[PDB]
Design a protein around this ligand. Structure first.
Ligand SMILES: Cn1cnc(Cn2c(=O)nc(Nc3cc4cn(C)nc4cc3Cl)n(Cc3cc(F)c(F)cc3F)c2=O)n1
Ligand SMILES: Cn1cnc(Cn2c(=O)nc(Nc3cc4cn(C)nc4cc3Cl)n(Cc3cc(F)c(F)cc3F)c2=O)n1
Lengths: 301, 301
């Protein structure tokens, strides 16, 4: 039992968080070597926020218009540039806490840890997934703009998300570390809707394996399905397609539990068609889709 | 949007984790100033684990029998002692990463972050609550013994839990940092059952306040109750009775919403006696009991 969302230890990222201020507009930045990365929205006044022309706004700024603080210590800005929606401020000191790192762009269904920060100060850490509609269902308050998402492999931090905004529905939108949005969003304070979301099938199946590993098996059956027939039903219920690569990735969980991937698909099909009849799985009344196969193996070994 | 389990940033604790080995028995320790704290179980060989005589096992050990490692760097042990179920190994180097810290003993219902560690290496962080039966529904594998639980207030780390063992039901038991077990458990490899658990009433009330803050308030009724009357009913539904301290910690939420604590108790009483009539609260048909009043204020404000 005890299977739960588990984040990566955040220390390597905490050592990189700073505050960036332009006028009275302020947010979080990420300090790696001698460069601070942050949302370019920081350059906007409250009027500019509504409909910014970023190239015009930026040409009207010099290095001295940017105040960067690492805790209480001011870092002097000696260059600036913009890459898509990300501002890069070159500073005159290298961050000694810089971890080994990469910038990566993730795919829908992939999970990451978020270090929520306020005015350059880390506040909390939790796991999220990239939704099929390219939103994230985060927990973020005012002042969180510029908080990052990441995975850690060995000692290497792969940064995948920089937080920009909350949409009217309460879900979140942001960019990769090259400043390209996930999804059809723009860095402007105007109401924006997302596309209709879908459920991440491969993750639901991973979580059903986690449930079996933890002794919860009521949902298993003896029905069988082909991959095609499973996918027909999945599509009907606004579930993402399950690919042969997904089947392959679920191989280790299948081996560990002795439940064939397609038999687990048959179980899921019946849950979609029948519902849960007031029962829970791993304490949940809903089918959970924010654990990847990797997440499950990592936590269960 | 919504509420989720959120951990504190783990960096301050990561910098204190070490590995402690005695013979082939190995687990995690906590390095603060020039002392490493770890479960005294480390001094057991396999043959000692069932019925250890700790005083006898310890008299036969010298400083030179303890291998304490920060990564692959050995820290030389210069003293050893036992305090309850914790071993304290004085080392010749003060940890430069020691945060401001306190040792605290928590009550049932209180939440904390767990930094799960293996062989002195942090692996993941998640939030947990102490159950009324003094177990935690954690996520731990073999090699996790000595992982710690903590809260961070300002820049001070309050350590509250040191993990020792997994019980037959898959829940977890451990000590405070003074080595006193939470609950009726002992540090021996014997099957030990937890007492029957109950629902954490103060946290359910915090959850209801969270729902009201978010405009979901169908369950507010025209009635009130005394604390005594409420407690007597609570017990009939396997809910914890409230203490005076519980009433007090609900004060900020009560003030924020203008809903008196006892009026909320009356609302909860109606839910216990009547059920939910097919309705949900914060999207769920189940009442959440692992968010404290502090957790609610942290996530809302
Ligand atoms: C509730 N919530 C959840 N996530 C967020 C993220 N977020 C944020 O923290 N701040 C925003 N706008 C700003 C206002 C400022 C006022 N001052 C003095 N300084 C400010 C700095 C910022 Cl960034 N926004 C809104 C927002 C941010 C963008 F980057 C963007 F492109 C469009 C937007 F509408 C925000 O969502 N808030
Ligand atoms: C599945 N699970 C979840 N939590 C735990 C924690 N846990 C643990 O990590 N290890 C334990 N026993 C050891 C065996 C060792 C073998 N080697 C080579 N070194 C070892 C060191 C330890 Cl600590 N235990 C069992 C256990 C540990 C105690 F501290 C105790 F007092 C009683 C116990 F039964 C364990 O639960 N495993």
């Amino acid at each position: 039992s005890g299977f739960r969302k588990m984040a990566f230890p955040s220390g390597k990222v905490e050592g990189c968080m700073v505050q960036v201020t332009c006028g009275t507009t302020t947010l979080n930045g990420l300090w790696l070597d001698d460069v601070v990365y942050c949302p370019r929205h920081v350059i906007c006044t409250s009027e500019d926020m509504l409909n910014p022309n970023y190239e015009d706004l930026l040409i009207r700024k010099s290095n001295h218009n940017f105040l960067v603080q690492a805790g209480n210590v001011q870092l002097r800005v000696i260059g600036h540039s913009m890459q898509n929606c990300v501002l890069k401020l070159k500073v005159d000191t290298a961050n000694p806490k810089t971890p080994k790192y990469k910038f990566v762009r993730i795919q829908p269904g992939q999970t990451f840890s978020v270090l929520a920060c306020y005015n350059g100060s880390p506040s909390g850490v939790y796991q999220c997934a990239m939704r099929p509609n390219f939103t994230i269902k985060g927990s973020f308050l005012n002042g969180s703009c510029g908080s990052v998402g990441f995975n850690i492999d060995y000692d290497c931090v792969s940064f995948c998300y920089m937080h920009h905004m909350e949409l009217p529905t309460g879900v979140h939108a942001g960019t990769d570390l090259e400043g390209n949005f996930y999804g059809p969003f723009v860095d402007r304070q105007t109401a924006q809707a997302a596309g209709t979301d879908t459920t991440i099938t491969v993750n639901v199946l991973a979580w059903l394996y986690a449930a079996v590993i933890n002794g919860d098996r009521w949902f298993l059956n003896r029905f069988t399905t082909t991959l095609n027939d499973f996918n027909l039903v999945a599509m009907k219920y606004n579930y993402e397609p399950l690919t042969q690569d997904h089947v392959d990735i679920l191989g280790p969980l299948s081996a560990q539990t002795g439940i064939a991937v397609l038999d687990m698909c048959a179980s899921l099909k019946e849950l979609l068609q029948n519902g849960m009849n007031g029962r829970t799985i791993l304490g949940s009344a809903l089918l959970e889709d924010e654990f990847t196969p990797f997440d499950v193996v990592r936590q269960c070994s």
